[PDB]
Symmetry: C4
Subunit: 91 residues, 4 copies
């Protein structure tokens, strides 16, 4: 497998783990909700809640700038790998 894809995967996972830890401890979310919030924030889908604490709001601002580029780089490389078998079967 492509090292470039593997590194993007690792960076993404590490970034989502850090968010899950932060929001589950600081904002009192269940782990699955902390992970969900991290994911929909960094992919810009968003959701129906926001952090309650000032610490949480500051973290989220920085989290977005730290992570959005990484996540969308991963989504793009993932898309190439997911769609390529179908392209190659059709070509």
């Amino acid at each position: 497998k492509d090292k470039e894809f593997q590194v993007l995967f690792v960076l993404t996972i590490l970034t989502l783990i850090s968010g899950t830890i932060f929001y589950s401890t600081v904002e009192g979310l269940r782990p699955i909700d902390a992970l969900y919030f991290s994911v929909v924030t960094l992919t810009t889908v968003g959701c129906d809640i926001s952090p309650q604490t000032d610490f949480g709001k500051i973290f989220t601002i920085l989290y977005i700038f730290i992570g959005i580029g990484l996540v969308f780089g991963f989504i793009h490389k993932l898309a190439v790998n997911v769609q390529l078998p179908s392209i190659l079967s059709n070509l």
Copy 2:
């Protein structure tokens, strides 16, 4: 004409069918609401609601990562291969 476009089109349709079936079954949404939720999620517009079940939350996370790349790949091919040539042709004085 463009086989990458054809693939991205079919994959996008299949993805939206899968979301419509999932969210109507697991989250109890009307089929039209399940399709709406799938579309606004994968285009990253977002929705006034969120999944209520843990199954729905886990599925949505995976659906987001796989689906955004496909849907926006389709949107780009649509813009380049259909909308842009249509706009250009519609600006020609005749």
Copy 3:
């Protein structure tokens, strides 16, 4: 002025007018709220409401695919024009 920018502007305005007309009449929104909903939908910011009618939900799905590419093309060209005087003053 660049014709490419002028056409993107016109297309964007026409698309937002169509959304404002639709959501103000079909979904019963005030004009400013119908315009706001159209804008945050096509730029993918989103907001705290969704269409109530099935007609509205179908329109919004199609609206997104019809308009998202146009709007982001305009946002990009706008950004070039807005930032260029500052770049040229700094270079």
Copy 4:
């Protein structure tokens, strides 16, 4: 080093200051909440709230169109000029 980056950085800071001042004044938000609202709007994440005043709604529409291009231009330059070289340097065996 990269003067386009410097411009996009300063313009992004000025934009977020303007939003923080606007939403705290016109919409009554705490400064920290006004900054948060400005950031999630211009990165297109979105927020659980929306402007309540018609002034806030009109401003936000204009803020979105001007601000998204600047903020995401900054994000791209940040990725290419800072984060990517930092990642590459941090992967070198030493």
